């Protein structure tokens, strides 16, 4: 008799629960996927802005981003989502790539 939209309830908003630093279970080494995504995001955002702390001068966003990662200057964080509780929580681990092991990206 009614429309489907009437009985539809939008998903309730969630809370971000951050696992404390001494309870983190995942690895302190970046995966090749995570390092690749970090460099790609940083390179596009340098194609937008251009401001960096990397002292040496390069003519490409990709070179700047790669050297920022290797020299531990990249201004990004990695969020690893562990679980979504059905009381409306999002339990995550935040990892700092400036303090992590970096894979071999020849």
Partner 1 sequence: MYADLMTRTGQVTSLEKAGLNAREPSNVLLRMALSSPVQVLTDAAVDSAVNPIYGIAAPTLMGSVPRIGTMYSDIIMDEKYITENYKS
Partner 2 sequence: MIDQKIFETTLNIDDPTNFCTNVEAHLLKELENIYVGKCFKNSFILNITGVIQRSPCFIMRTNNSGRGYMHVRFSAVVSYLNAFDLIAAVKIIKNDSNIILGESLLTEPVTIVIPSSESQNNVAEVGQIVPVQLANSSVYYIPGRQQASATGSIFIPKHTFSVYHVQEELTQEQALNLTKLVNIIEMLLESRSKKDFKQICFFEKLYYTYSISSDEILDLKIWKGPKGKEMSRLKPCNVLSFLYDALKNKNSSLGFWARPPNLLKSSPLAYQQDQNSFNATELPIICSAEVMFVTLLKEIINYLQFINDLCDTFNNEQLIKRHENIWMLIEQRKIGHDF
Partner 3 sequence: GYANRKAIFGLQSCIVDYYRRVSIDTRLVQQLYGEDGLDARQLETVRFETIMLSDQELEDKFKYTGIQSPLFEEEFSRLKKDRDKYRQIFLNVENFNFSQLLTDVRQVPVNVASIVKNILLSSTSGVLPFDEKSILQKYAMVKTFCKNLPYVFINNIQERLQTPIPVYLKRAASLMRMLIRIELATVKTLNITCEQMSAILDLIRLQYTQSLINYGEAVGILAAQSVSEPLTQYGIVRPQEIFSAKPVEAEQSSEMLLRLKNPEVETNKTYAQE
**Residues contributing to the site for partner 1 (CB under 8 A):** 31, 33-34, 36-38, 40-41, 51, 53, 75-81, 94, 96, 98
Task: Provide the minimum distance between the beta carbon of 59 and partner 2 in the complex, in angstroms, as a whole number.
Answer: 19
Choose the contact partner of 47 out of partner 1, partner 3, partner 2, none; CB within 5 to 8 A by kind. Answer: partner 2
Can you spell out the DSSP letters for 32-65? HHHHHHHHHHHHHHHHH-------S--SSHHHHH
The CA distance from 26 to 28, in Å, is 7
- Pick one of 21, 26, 70, 75: the residue that binds partner 2 (CB under 8 A): 75
Query: What tokens does 20 get?
Result: 């404390």
- Pick one of 5, 11, 25, 48: the residue that binds partner 2 (CB under 8 A): 48
- Pick one of 14, 26, 89, 96: the residue that binds partner 3 (CB under 8 A): 26
41 interacts with partner 2 by CB under 8 A: yes
Cβ neighbours, 10 Å, residue 41 = 13
Residues 6+ apart with CB under 8 A from 66: 39, 105
Stretch that binds partner 2, among 20-28, 48-56, 65-73, 95-103 (CB under 8 A): 48-56
81 interacts with partner 2 by CB under 8 A: no
Q: What is the CA radius of gyration of the chain?
A: 19
DSSP state of 28: S
């Amino acid at each position: 008799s009614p429309s489907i939209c009437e009985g539809f309830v939008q998903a309730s908003s969630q809370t971000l629960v951050i696992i404390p630093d001494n309870e983190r279970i995942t690895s302190n080494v970046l995966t090749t996927f995570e390092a690749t995504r970090l460099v790609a995001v940083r390179a596009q955002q340098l194609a937008i802005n251009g401001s960096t702390m990397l002292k040496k001068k390069y003519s490409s966003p990709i070179d700047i981003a790669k050297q920022e990662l290797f020299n531990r200057k990249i201004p990004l964080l990695v969020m690893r989502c562990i679980k979504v509780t059905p009381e409306g929580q999002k339990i995550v681990e935040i990892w700092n790539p400036r303090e992590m092991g970096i894979p071999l990206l020849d």
